[PDB]
Structure formats: structure tokens, C-alpha cells
Paper text:
Retromer is a master regulator of cargo retrieval from endosomes, which is critical for many cellular processes including signaling, immunity, neuroprotection, and virus infection. The core of retromer is a trimer comprising vacuolar protein sorting (VPS) proteins VPS35, VPS26, and VPS29. Here, we elucidate the structural basis of membrane tubulation and coupled cargo recognition by metazoan and fungal retromer coats assembled with the non–Bin1/Amphiphysin/Rvs (BAR) sorting nexin SNX3 using cryo–electron tomography. The retromer core retains its arched, scaffolding structure but changes its mode of membrane recruitment when assembled with different SNX adaptors, allowing cargo recognition at subunit interfaces.
Numbering used by the authors:
A (entry chain A), C (entry chain C): 12 to 306, 387 to 535, 554 to 857
B (entry chain B), D (entry chain D): 0 to 146, 153 to 177, 181 to 195
């Protein structure tokens, strides 16, 4: 390439220039070498990237040139070679000649700097080439970076004022190139020319980089508010002001900026709609964020500023909501605690934008992601959003989201509400959760329960945090809040059952302090039944009824424990009933009546019209079956009116004693045995004998009278005999004989 | 060895009468500690089964009441550490707690280890009539049916001996408690 | 095409023939023109359709020819011209003029007719061409039609045998050209030439027509029947046999067929197999029907003909059985009288011919259709059923009948019996209908009630239609027949319940003449309870056993009404038992214990020692029901165990009043009171209190010695206060108030 | 009106305890006459139900003591034509036809019309305490199941009146009867 050839040539040129400078006394040929080397620098045959590489090469060589400057040139002088070689109409050769002279002079003495610098700037009127102008002024800045005066400003040519003047004029003229550079040349070159612009922005920002160590806030604002802002209003280039305000943000102590960024915003509210105003704004907001929450109602001022802006702009969904959520985070930075204004942003800034945004359903628009981020920003932000949860204009904003956004926010909210555990709640949470649920499955395999099941669980569980008196009213809230329709409450109810039923105990903790606890307990029974049918209202589902059956059973034993057991009686009956509805599976009822028996067996406080009655009723239940062994099982399980069983029977219905019905249930057992005699199977009969002798010795050792040792000895011998005498082998037989000899040991 | 810590975790009742294990003891259930987990059914909710699978290297269950769809999963499961026939259950099938009727059913299933978590929900253990009695109460620490502490036990079963490290979270402020019990089977 | 030219030539020939006929004396020229006329058709180029059209044209032409002939020429004669043109070489005009002059002679000369005809027939032998021969002979016969030498000629020139010769020669020549018509013209034209044969066969049958104009049975059977059957068996041609014989049969009257059947049937039975002998013998049987249906074992002889042609031919089973359908119809036209003959040949012989014919699968097989038609033939032909009911062997035929036809015919015969009263069933009748049944239900949507719902209803009812005494053994035979299987009589046992129950009192009604009514009554009771337990033993009824309950109840109630307390006490104990075994559904349990109540209620004379024990058991089991409101319902009906109610409790020692133990009545009244105080439902309890009020006030008006007006006042004031103080608004509340008003009016 | 052919009839204990109605009523009770048939239930088969639905599109079917399968059809029902309220049911509650219980249940029903199945098939009629007492009977008076008249009456209900046309099929030789004994509600 031309780049390679030019680099090789200028490399040999700087090689001989080193031969000149390292061996002193050759100042004339060295100056001529520098002049002819910059003669190739006016040759712009190097593409701006190639030109950039060659300029970096000559710039690192030129740092050594400036070292040789500081080492040799401070001796006496260099006299007006610029005007002496001025004979040609050209400018750049003698230009850089006297420029090297001025770099020497600034290397020695700080006084002559401003004189020769204004000389260069004035005689630069002949340089119509803006690219060479920018390259030159950048060279001067990077050079005079170590030579531009500072707070030691004392009055010689070159001071803070004069250095900022020099750097500012070089900056703005390099800006003038940086603009034309996008457009100088052929019109079709605009793409590569924007490339040049982007490549050389930092070469101009170096001016501000040097401005970093410079004028304080008053001087700052005065010296900067005018000139560069007018440069901005004149260029109207996006990348220009973008990079500019970027370097500004990072350049001065922002006690300067933010005390000016207010009126700076007031000035720069002028931006065109096709200019990337939002990037500017969000970079500002970045400064303001790591300003504030890094551990002038900027709300008012800056919010109204951006109000004007979006009002002056025409921000579609995307830019609008991007700036919206950025504003959200920004308020979360500056005024977390000035919440009033934050919920103002919510309602009369952000909700008014929301509806004011007359944009149809939009998810491909990432602006919805921005709004979701926005909504969760104080969620994601507070450790205590329950504080903001006390705001509806926090939550009442939610209708303004669409079904997909709705359950998005649903997943987010449930996350919020699952990680935490609920404290003392006024009805307020109940408002919040009305919202939640009416968003939840309202309006109209659940692959992820999404997430309502694990949700509802922890929902009703945190609900237990509530206290008794209002717990019933909010139980109302819950229950009918579950007026959604059918195929959900299977995923719901037992929790709810339990909620009511343990509220029974919480309430009952005041029975020594109440009589209306009878009436409030009524209120319970009512609401119980309310839910109960509410689910019985839902018969359509498989395997879910049996559940509510058991649930009814639980409420029953509850009231049993609530000592106001007047009605659990009725629960138990209607439980049998809804069984008789729910009769479809064998093993189902098997376990079902098993549970019936367990529960009732754990019931010992009812009166005979309940007590003995229900005994007979469950006896019936048992009797009402189809297949033998399991039946017999439950049968002899149900044996509990008269004698010793079980230890848990600490009951004063029989003087701390046990009730193991002996004789009647015994004849029922004999009934079952003869019925089983109709089976004609070996292992079944084996079992039969097993449980037979089990309960036989169970009576004899527990002092049961009519179970005499004669029956038992004769029958165990009979079982052993017919077992051995007419029954074929199977491992069951031998394990049973083992069990049997064990029982013999246990006969005592 | 240190291979099979036999925790007695049960009385799940989730969401039946419970939802979650105390955080300390729940995270005490991180995988890699034991390859052996002893869940005893009526979990119930599907999420319980999912988190169990994610958390449990061992799947051996009994069949449970509140459990509508996986009614296929067995009534019980026999285990052997060293040489033992191990029986585990809830205690629902019998009307009472009678250790002799219990071991009756056990012989009907031929197991010499006898562990359960029934409907009175207590911890107590001893031997009567030559067999050992294992019930810890609500291993989930839930409220009982009676008038609880979550009780799982580092049951150290190899050969015929059992060492029991029960971890207990009881409130005075809650308090994590450990009691050490040792049992050797009469072989 | 040439046929049209022949037709126009014949038209012009008839034109010149008309011209020659209208001119007498030129009748010789007329005969010449007629010979030219017939020469146009003499060629075999005229297709038998157009040949016969030309033949009828020339035939009407020769009709006028022979008319004008018999007018002009037979004035004396033509002198022996028959022989003069009998030897000349030119044969055709010779023959045509000869037949014309023979026609003239037959017109004028009645005696020499047979000579001329026979000589023409003899000279017809020298030619072997059948076309010209047949058509020439048809012309001659059409001439000789009106003067056959026959039975009208009683011995002069012509007799029976003369017409015999005439017609038989004509007919055999007809048959000669007729069978040649199967081979006439082209060979590949078989179907067309046979169609032409069929077109011309009417000319053949014309001889049969002429024969029908002749002698009666005797001389026929003498001189013609023999020859008739002779030609019949001598044709030996499928088409000749078929067509000619069907013509014969259709033609000749039955005075001939009086004694000429059997040998004729035999002659037919041995003819060609390619004939549809089935159809023609069916037509014969249809003539036989024309005989029978009008109000020497031709029955059996004809069956023998049947068997012979079964052997002499190769009969498809289908054809056979269809013929048998027709035979059965004919025979049950013949001997419905002592049908034993008919059923002999049909079942005992013809049905056996079937079981011989081991037919392959046949429903779509027309053998099956002939089957069903034959089978129903007696059944539909029957006017009275014990004709069939006398047929005991169809039970095998039942097996010999195929499955769907089995069902069809069985439903047929049964409902035919059913449409009106059936009679007593003799043993054979019994087991026959039992066979019917054990084929139908046994062996093995109720759009058929498959199938016997009404059928078993009518069955069990007509069981009564039988003879009083045997009805018991009939019960036993039927309960044997009521072994259809554990899954068949499920709900149609209550019929046999009815049977036993009615027979109970029926046989009770014979005590004045045989004391075994008590012993055999007990024996019944045993057989009954057997059957009843059996349906209990149909435990496989889905809790549905309220029936068997009701049936035992009916029975025991009648037993006590038949005053058989012994097993009445026993069988009501059994009712107790099965009751508890069956006591199943709240609502049900209610109704059924009401049934048990009524079971008690209807008694009058039962022993009190058992009565009061039953009272105790009742009150117990009553108290052994479950649900509260319905329970107190049970309670108030339960006190009828004591009160001056029911029919059970009406003693004529009570001064026509009833048992009236109003004390325990009021006791249970207090019980139900307590219970209603605890149902935990306002309005139901209220209405129930009203009901109890009504009980008490009726007893007051019924004068219960235990009804205290203090209880009146206390309860009414309690209720009046509650309805005034605490009754919640509802319509049933208004019902309570108004009926309370009614009660107040009733207080007297 | 012949649009009100209100008839209490039937009750032949069928298919169990009869065979069928003879052609006399069959043609007398064939389609084309009755627009409103009054059913007494307990047929007990289905085909007769079909036939009776065929008799008129206006029936009132009831479950009876021999009616098991349709467990659903309750036993009582009331209808009203003008000011007449036609209540009807089994009567199972009755231990005897005591007018007190009769009128009492009627008041529970708020009716003056009488239809049931007792035990006997025995008719009587009279006035006592504002109500009249009419036995629904059977078709020709089948055997003993209803506290022996062939019960059928061309009955039009008007206001408080029912035109009771007392008709019987009496044996002497069953013969049709055309007679009338009409009752109107006292009110």
C-alpha cells in the first residue's frame, strides 16, 4: 500500500533525523529533514486510518524530536526562518518549520508560548485544508499539554485563561474539521468519513483531557458555558455532543457539572429529534446515579427538563420508556426516601405516559422490557418495598399492563412475595392481593403451576401471619377471592381448610375470655361450609372429591378439638354422604374407610346419639364391601366399645380405661372368618389365621375374659394342622409359622 | 463406612398441614451429605416430589393417604444395611399403636427394623417383646393431632447397631439441638 | 334388408291373390299365385320373427284362399289329383296344391279326411328338412283344425286314435324343427335361434290347445294319457320337457288329473337335470293347491315322488327345502285334521331329509330362506296352536334350525301363544316350552329387553293358567327351568315370587278337603325361601337387593296372613337378617325399613310372644338409622309399634280399637323431641315440631291416656314463642303458621 | 273439556304380577283422546311408561314401592289448575289411613287432592274437616296394594271443581260404566 511505502520512507527519514539529532551540530540539516518529513504529512495520500498509523509513528518519533528540542534548542534562539522561506504560495512547510521552532521555545520558556500560538492560529487562515489543521492542532495540544499554563497563571503570555483559549480554539477548529471530515471530499465517501470522525474524536477529546487539571467551577462555567455550547449549537452533530458531554461528565469534579448540568440541561434542551438525545440523557443519569446512591429538587428540575425534552422530542414507545425506566432508577438514586415525588413519577409522570402512550400491545418492542424493569426497579431496589406496597399508585398502575406483561409482572411479584415472609398486615396486603389474584388467573398440565400453586401455598401461608379477629374477615377475602371458576381450587383448598381450622384454635385461645367465641365459632362453621360447598360446587374433577371428604373429616376432628363439637357430628355424617356420592374405586374406599375409622377412633367426646350411633354406622360402612381380606382388616380394626384398647384411650367415659369392643365385634369377626372360608386360597387363609391369633392373644394378654385359652390353643393347633395337613408349601407358609411360634412365645 | 445415614424425615403434610422445613434444617438437607434419603409419603404436592428429586439421592417410599395420582407407589419398601430386614411406615394402617400388633404386621411383611410416624406424633423408643420401637413424632415439626419438633435422626445402621444423631430446632428464639442415641439390634 | 323386399313381394302377391280370388274360375290362377306367395317365405332367409310375420300374413291370405276354395272348387272334386301330383319331380308346388285340395276335401268330404292327412304325413318322411316341413304342417293343421277325426267321430271315419295320430305327428314335427331351432342358422347364434324357438313354440302349443277341446277323463286315460306321458318322457330335451309340459299342465282340466297324477309325477321325476324341474313341479303343486285350498296317499305318494326325484335328480338343498315349503303348505291344506300323518312326513321324514342334507352355513344361502319358509309354513297355516303344541320333536328341529332363524321362529311361536290365553301345560308341553326357553335365554339397550321382558311376564302369568294342583310341581319344573344362570333372571325372578305367593293362598284354600295344605304349605314356604335366598345369593346385585327384601316381605306377610306364624316368625327373622346385611342407603334404608314396618303392619293374628319381641327388634333397628331429620321421621313412625295402630295392632279385645301402648309411644315421643332439639337446623326442626304436635293432638282426639295437656301447653307455647320471636322469614315459615292454625282448630 | 282427561287408573303390578290390560281399556286408553294423563307410577316396567307418555304429553310419573332403578324420582309432586292444587305421593309415611295424618300431610303440601298407594284397594268417600277423601284406585282394581274399584274418571278441573265421572270396568264379565260422582273443593 501507499501506507507501507510512506511509512518506510518516513522511517528512513526519521532514522537520518536521529543521525542528525543524536550527534549535535547538525541543526540545519535536521530542521530541513523535519520540514521535508512534514512535507509528506501535507501529502494526504495516506487514508485516514493509514494516515493515523503514520501519524502515530511520526508522533512517537516526534516525542523524541521534542526531547532533542528540550536538549539542544534552549541555547539561544531561532530567527524568523518562517518569513525568510515565505516566498512560495504554500503554507504548510514554513508552517511546520516555525511550529517546530515554537515547540522548541515552549520547551525552554513558558513566556513566548501564547505569542507564537496566536501567530500560528492567525496565519492559519491560509490553511483551507481542515484535516491538516486538525492534525496540527492535535499535535500542538499533545505537545503543549506539558506546556500549557495552569493555576500558576501569573500574567506572562500563556495562563489558565490563555491556555484554555489556545486549547479551546484548537478544540473547536479540530471540531470544524471533525464535522467537515464527515463531508469533505466526494459525497459518496460519507461512510468512510464518519469512520474518520469516529476514529479521530479522541484526538479532539484530548483537549478536554488536558482541561481535566484546570479551571475551577466559576472559571469552569464561565469559560465553558459560552464557547463550547455555541460550537454545539453550530455543529448539531450527534456524535460530537455525545462524546463531548461524555468527556465533560468524566472530566471535571462534578460539583462543577451538576451545579451547571441543571442550567446545562436548560441550554441543551434544543436537541433535534434525529439526534441521539437519549444516550446523552442516560449517560448523564449514570453520572447522577453513581453520584447519589454511591453510598435543587433534581426531581422537579431535571424531570421537568426531560419532560420538555420528550415533549420537544417525539419519543416513540422505545425511547420514551427507556428514558422512563432510566428516570425510575435515577429517582431511586437521588430521592429513594423522597418517595412522594417517586409515586408522583409513578402516577402523574409514568402512568400518564402509559395511557398517554397510545401504543398497541408491544412485546417485540423492548420498551415493554424497559417498563417491566421500571416497575420492578423499586421492587428490585428496596429491601423494604412493603413500604411502597402501602401505595396503590404504586400498584394500581398494574391494570395498564397487557396479558403477557400481566403474567410477566405476575412472575416477578410472586418472586418478590415468595423470597420473603409476611409480617403484621392491615387489610392493605388484602388490597394488594386482590390485585394480585385478579391479575393471577383472572380474567380468563399447568406447566409451571405458573406459579400460582407454590404461589398460593406460600400466599395462604404468609396469610397465617394475620391475627384471629380479622383473620376470619380476610378469610372471606381469600375464599370468595377464589371465585374464579372450576379447575383451580384442587390446587388450592386443603391449605384453605387448614387456614380456617387452625384459626379455630387461634380463636379458641380466647374461649376463657369469650362466650361469643361460640358465635364467632359459628361464623367459622358457616364459612367452613361456605368453602366446603364452594369446592363441592366443583364436582367435575377426578380424585379431588375424596380429598374434600378427608378435608371435611379434618374440620370435624377440628371442631372436636375446638370443644364446640356440636356440628362436627354433622360434618362426619355428610362425609359419609359425599362418600356415597364418591363411590367408584375399591382401594380408594379401602384407605378411605381406613381414615374414617382412624378419625372416629380418635373421637371420644361425643354423646351416645353420636357415640354409639356412629359406631354402628361405621360398622355398616365396613360391612358394605366387596372383597374379603382388606375388609376383615378394617373390621377387627373397628372393635372399640367395651374392653382393653388402646393406651391412647385416656378416657373418663370408661374411667381412664380402654374400650376394645369384645363380644359383639367378635361375633362380627367370626362372621368375617366364615365369609372368608368361601375364598379357597392358601395365602389369604394364612393371613386370616395370622390376624385371628393376633387378636386372640391380643385379648387374652389384655385380660379379655370370654377369649379363653382353650379356644386359642385348640385353634392354633387346628391352624397348624390344616396348614400342614392339607395346605401346599409357599414361603408365606413358613414365614407365618415363624410368626406363629413367635406368637406362642408371646402368649405369656 | 459412613455410607448410609438413615434420617427419619417425614410427617410432610405439604401442603396438607405444612409447607416448608425450617431454613437451617432444610438446607441441612443439601445433597452430597447422604446418598440415602428417607421420605415416607403424603408429601404431597407435585412440587414436593420435584424438589425431593432435585434434593434426594434415595427414593424408597410407602404409600400415603393424601396422594391421589401416584397411588402406584408402593405401600412400603424393605431395606438391608448389613443384614437387616427393615420396615418403615406411618402407622395409619392399624387402629392403634400396639407395638405387638405392629410387629405382627411386620412379620406379615418380614422386617426386623420397625420405624413409623403416626397420628399421635411423638418421639419415644424402647424394646418390648424382643423388638425395637421407632417413632420420632412430626419429623417436619408440624402440629399434631393430639391435645412439634422436626425430628430426623442420623441413624447409623451398619451391621446390627444404630447410632442416632437427632437434630432438633426448638424455640426457647429457636435453638438447633442435637441428641445422640445408640441402638444395637438383638440379632 | 332383403327381408323387406320379400315383404313387399308378398304384399304384391296377396294383391294379385285377392284379384284372382274375387274372380271365380281363375281359382286355378289363384292357386298358382298362392304357390308363388308361399315360395317367397319358403326360404330360410326370413328370420323366425320376420319369417313368422310373413307367415301370419300369408296365413291370413290363405284363409281367404281356402274360403274361396271351399266356395268354388269342392262342388264335386278334383279327380284324384292328389296322386297325379304325388309322383312328379317338382315337389314344392305339388305339395302346396295338394294341401290346398286336401283342405277343400276336408271341407266337403268328411270321411276321407284321415286318409289324405295320413298320406301327407307319410310323404313328409322323405324330406329331412324341418323348416319347410313344420311350416307346411302348421298350414295344413290350421286348415284341419276345425275337423279333427276325434271323439266327435264315434266310429265312422275318424276316432280317438285318428286325432291322436294327427296331433301327435304334428307335435313331433313341431318338436323336430323346434329342437333344430337350437341349431338353425349360424352356430354362434345359439341364443338368438333359441329366442326364435321360444317365439315359435306357441305354434307348437296350439296342438295342446286343440287337445284340450276333446274327450273327458275316461277315454283320455285310456287312449291319450298313455301317449301323453310317452311323448313327455320321449322328448328327453330340457327345453322341450320344460315348455311343452308347463303348457300341458296349464291347459288340461283336473277331471283328467283326478287319477292321472302319480304315474305322471313319476315320469317327470326322471327327466333331464338341466331342466328347472323345481319350478315346474312347483307349478304342478300349485295346481294341487288349486285343488286343496278349496273348502290314496297322494300326500304320501307325492312325498315318495319327492324322494324319488331327490334321488333320480341331483337336488340342491335349497330347491329341496323350498319344494318342501310348498309341500307343507299343501299338506296342511290337506290334513290339518289328524295332522299326525303330515307332521310325520314333514318333521319325521322331510325334516330328516334336511338333517341328512348337512347344509353348509346358510343365512344368505337361499337354502336358509326355504328353511324358514318351510318351518313357519305349519305355524302360519295353523289356526289353533296345540297343533304345534302337539309337535314335540321340533325341539330337535329347533336345534336343526339355525341360530337367527331359531330366534325368529321362537319369538314368532311364543308371541302367537301370547296374544291370547294359553292353556295348561302338560308335562310334554312343559318341557317343550322349557326347551324353547333354555334355547332362548339360556343357552347363551333393551331394544329387545333381550328378549323376554314381556315374554317372561306372560310366561309367569300363564303359569297360573295351568291346572291348580299340579301348579306346585310346575313351580318346581320351572325353577329348574329357572336355572338360566347367575346372570339372567336378575330382575325377572319377582315373577316367580308372584307365582309362589299366589299359589300359597290358592293351595291354602283347600283345607276343608286335605290337611296337607298345612304340610305342603310349609313345604312351599321352604321351596320359596330357597328361591328367595337364591336371589339374595345373587349377592351380585349392586346394593339393589331391596327387591329380594320386598319379596321375602310379601311372602312372610302372606304367611302370617295364611296364618303360618311358625315360618312367618322365622322368615321375618330372615328379613331382619338380610335387612341388616342389605341396609344400605340413607334414603333407601328409610324406604326399606318402612317396608319392614308395613310387613309388620298388615298382620292381625300373629302370636304376641313373638309380636312384642319383633316390636323390640324394630324399635332397635329403627334407632339404627343415621341421619337426623329423616331419623325423627323414622321415630314418629316407629311408635306405631305400640299405639292404637296399625292393622298389626288392632285387637278386638280393644273394643274394636287397636293395641294402644301410648305410654312407650309418648316415651319415643320424648326421644324424638330431644333429637329434634339437636338437629342443628331451624326450619326443619320447626316443621318437625309441628308434626309432633299433630301426633300428640291426634292422640288427644284419639284419647291417648298418656297425652297430657301440660305437654300440649308447654310445647305449643314454646313453639308459639319461637315462631313469634326467632323464626326467620321464609315460605315454609308461613306453612308452619297456617298448619299450626289448622292444628289449633283441631285441638277441640 | 277433553283437554282435561284427569284420570287415576292403572296399577296392575306389571310386568311382575299381571300380564297386560285387555283390549277394552287399551282401545279406551289409546292415543287420540287424552291430552293430560295423570300417572300413578309404580308400573313398573319401561314399555308401559312409553305407552303412557304416548297417551298424552302431560303425565306425572312417580317412584313406587316396586320402583328401584330410577333412585332419583322423588315420591311427591303437586300441580295446580286455577285454584285447585293437586298434590300426590306414595303414602309410605302412613301406618294407617288416619284422616289426621292425611290432612296434615296435605297441609304440608297445601293440597286437597288425594292420590297414593296404600295396602288394600278399598275405596270410600265422604266429607270431614274441609277436605274430601278420594282413593286413586287402579285400572280395574288389581290386588291388595292401595288403601277394589276400577278407578278411572273423565275429570276436568275448573276453579275449585273437578268433574269426577265415576267409571268402572265391573265383572259380572267386565263391563264399562258411565256414571258420575263429582266433588268441588270447599273454600
Amino acid at each position: 500500500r501507499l501506507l507501507e511505502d510512506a511509512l518506510i520512507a518516513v522511517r528512513q527519514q526519521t532514522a537520518m533525523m536521529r543521525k542528525f539529532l543524536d550527534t549535535p551540530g547538525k541543526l540545519m540539516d535536521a530542521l530541513k529533514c523535519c520540514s521535508t518529513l512534514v512535507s509528506e504529512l501535507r501529502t494526504s495520500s495516506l487514508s485516514p486510518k493509514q494516515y493515523y498509523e503514520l501519524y502515530m509513528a511520526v508522533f512517537d518519533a516526534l516525542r523524541y524530536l521534542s526531547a532533542h528540542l528540550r536538549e539542544n534548542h534552549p541555547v539561544n534562539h531561532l530567527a524568523d526562518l518562517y518569513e525568510l522561506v515565505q516566498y512560495a504560495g504554500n503554507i504548510i512547510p514554513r508552517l511546520y518549520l516555525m511550529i517546530t521552532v515554537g515547540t522548541a521555545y515552549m520547551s525552554i520558556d513558558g513566556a513566548p508560548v501564547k505569542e507564537l500560538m496566536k501567530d500560528m492560529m492567525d496565519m492559519s487562515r491560509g490553511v483551507q485544508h481542515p484535516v491538516r489543521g486538525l492534525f496540527l492542532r492535535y499535535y500542538l495540544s499533545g505537545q503543549a499539554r506539558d506546556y500549557l499554563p495552569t493555576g500558576d497563571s501569573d500574567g506572562p503570555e500563556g495562563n489558565l485563561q490563555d491556555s484554555i483559549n489556545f486549547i479551546l480554539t484548537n478544540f473547536v477548529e479540530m471540531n470544524k474539521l471533525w464535522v467537515r471530515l464527515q463531508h469533505q471530499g466526494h459525497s459518496r465517501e460519507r461512510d468512510l468519513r464518519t469512520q474518520e470522525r469516529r476514529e479521530l474524536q479522541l484526538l479532539v477529546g484530548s483537549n478536554i483531557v488536558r482541561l481535566s487539571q484546570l479551571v475551577d467551577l466559576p472559571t469552569y462555567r464561565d469559560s465553558i458555558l459560552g464557547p463550547l455550547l455555541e460550537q454545539i449549537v453550530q455543529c448539531r452533530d450527534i456524535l460530537a455532543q455525545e462524546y463531548l458531554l461524555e468527556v465533560i461528565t468524566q472530566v471535571f469534579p462534578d460539583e462543577y457539572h451538576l451545579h451547571t448540568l441543571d442550567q446545562f440541561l436548560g441550554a441543551v434542551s434544543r436537541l433535534n429529534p434525529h439526534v441521539n438525545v437519549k444516550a446523552i440523557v442516560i449517560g448523564m443519569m449514570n453520572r447522577l446515579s453513581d453520584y447519589a446512591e454511591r453510598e435543587v429538587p433534581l426531581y422537579d428540575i431535571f424531570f421537568d427538563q426531560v419532560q420538555h425534552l420528550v415533549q420537544a422530542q417525539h419519543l416513540p414507545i422505545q425511547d420514551t420508556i427507556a428514558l422512563c425506566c432510566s428516570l425510575a432508577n435515577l429517582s431511586l438514586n437521588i430521592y429513594p426516601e423522597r418517595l412522594d415525588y417517586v409515586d408522583g413519577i409513578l402516577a402523574y409522570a409514568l402512568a400518564k405516559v402509559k395511557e398517554h402512550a397510545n401504543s398497541a400491545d408491544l412485546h417485540s418492542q423492548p420498551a415493554q422490557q424497559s417498563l417491566l424493569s421500571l416497575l420492578q426497579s423499586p421492587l428490585r431496589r428496596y429491601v423494604s418495598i412493603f413500604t411502597a406496597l402501602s401505595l396503590p399508585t404504586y400498584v394500581s398502575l398494574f391494570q395498564a399492563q397487557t396479558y403477557p406483561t400481566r403474567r410477566a409482572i405476575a412472575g416477578e411479584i410472586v418472586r418478590t412475595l415468595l423470597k420473603n415472609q409476611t409480617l403484621i398486615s392491615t387489610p392493605a396486603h388484602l388490597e394488594n392481593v386482590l390485585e394480585i389474584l385478579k391479575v393471577l388467573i383472572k380474567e380468563g398440565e399447568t406447566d409451571e403451576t405458573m406459579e400460582e400453586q407454590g404461589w398460593l401455598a406460600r400466599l395462604v401461608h404468609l396469610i397465617h401471619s394475620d391475627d384471629n379477629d380479622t383473620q376470619f374477615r380476610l378469610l372471606q377475602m381469600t375464599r370468595k377471592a377464589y371465585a374464579e371458576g372450576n379447575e383451580r381450587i384442587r390446587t388450592t383448598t386443603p391449605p384453605l381448610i387448614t387456614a380456617g381450622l387452625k384459626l379455630a384454635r387461634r380463636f379458641k385461645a380466647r374461649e376463657h375470655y369469650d362466650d361469643n367465641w361460640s358465635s364467632q365459632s359459628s361464623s367459622l362453621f358457616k364459612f367452613l361450609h361456605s368453602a366446603i360447598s364452594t369446592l363441592y360446587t366443583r364436582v367435575n374433577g377426578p380424585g379431588v372429591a375424596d380429598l374434600c371428604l378427608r378435608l371435611f373429616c379434618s374440620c370435624g376432628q377440628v371442631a372436636d378439638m375446638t370443644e364446640f363439637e356440636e356440628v362436627a357430628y354433622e360434618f362426619f355424617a355428610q362425609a359419609f354422604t359425599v362418600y356415597e356420592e364418591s363411590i367408584s374405586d375399591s382401594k380408594a374406599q379401602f384407605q378411605a374407610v381406613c381414615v374414617i375409622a382412624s378419625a372416629l377412633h380418635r373421637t371420644r367426646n361425643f354423646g351416645r346419639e353420636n357415640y354409639d350411633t356412629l359406631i354402628t354406622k361405621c360398622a355398616q360402612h365396613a360391612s358394605k364391601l366387596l372383597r374379603k381380606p382388606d375388609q376383615c382388616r378394617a373390621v377387627y380394626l373397628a372393635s372399640h366399645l367395651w374392653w382393653a384398647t388402646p393406651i391412647a384411650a385416656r378416657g373418663e367415659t370408661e374411667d381412664t380405661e380402654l374400650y376394645r369392643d369384645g363380644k359383639r365385634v367378635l361375633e362380627c369377626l367370626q362372621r368375617a372368618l366364615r365369609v372368608a372360608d368361601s375364598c379357597m386360597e392358601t395365602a389369604t387363609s394364612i393371613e386370616l389365621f395370622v390376624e385371628i391369633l393376633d387378636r386372640y392373644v391380643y385379648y387374652f394378654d389384655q385380660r379379655n375374659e370370654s377369649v379363653t385359652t382353650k379356644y386359642l390353643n385348640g385353634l392354633i393347633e387346628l391352624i397348624h394342622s390344616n396348614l400342614a395337613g392339607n395346605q401346599q408349601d409357599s414361603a408365606s407358609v413358613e414365614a407365618s409359622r415363624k410368626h406363629f411360634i413367635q406368637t406362642l412365645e408371646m402368649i405369656q | 463406612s459412613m455410607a448410609f445415614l438413615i434420617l427419619v424425615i417425614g410427617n410432610l403434610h405439604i401442603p396438607d398441614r405444612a409447607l416448608d422445613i425450617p431454613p437451617k434444617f432444610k438446607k441441612l438437607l443439601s445433597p452430597g451429605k447422604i446418598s440415602q434419603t428417607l421420605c415416607l409419603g403424603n408429601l404431597t404436592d407435585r412440587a414436593t416430589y420435584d424438589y425431593l428429586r432435585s434434593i434426594s439421592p434415595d427414593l424408597k417410599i410407602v404409600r400415603g393417604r393424601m396422594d391421589v395420582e401416584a397411588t402406584s407407589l408402593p405401600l412400603m419398601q424393605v431395606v438391608t444395611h448389613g443384614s437387616l430386614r427393615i420396615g418403615f411406615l406411618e402407622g395409619f394402617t392399624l387402629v392403634s399403636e400396639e407395638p405387638d400388633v405392629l410387629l405382627a404386621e411386620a412379620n406379615k411383611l418380614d422386617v426386623d427394623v420397625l420405624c413409623w410416624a403416626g397420628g399421635s406424633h411423638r418421639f419415644e423408643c424402647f424394646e418390648y417383646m424382643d423388638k425395637f420401637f421407632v417413632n420420632p413424632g412430626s419429623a417436619t415439626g408440624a402440629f399434631t393431632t393430639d391435645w412439634v419438633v422436626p425430628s430426623f435422626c442420623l441413624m447409623d445402621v451398619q451391621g446390627i447397631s444404630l447410632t442416632l444423631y437427632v437434630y432438633q430446632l426448638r424455640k426457647d428464639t429457636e435453638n438447633v439441638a442435637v441428641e445422640k442415641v445408640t441402638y444395637t439390634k438383638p440379632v
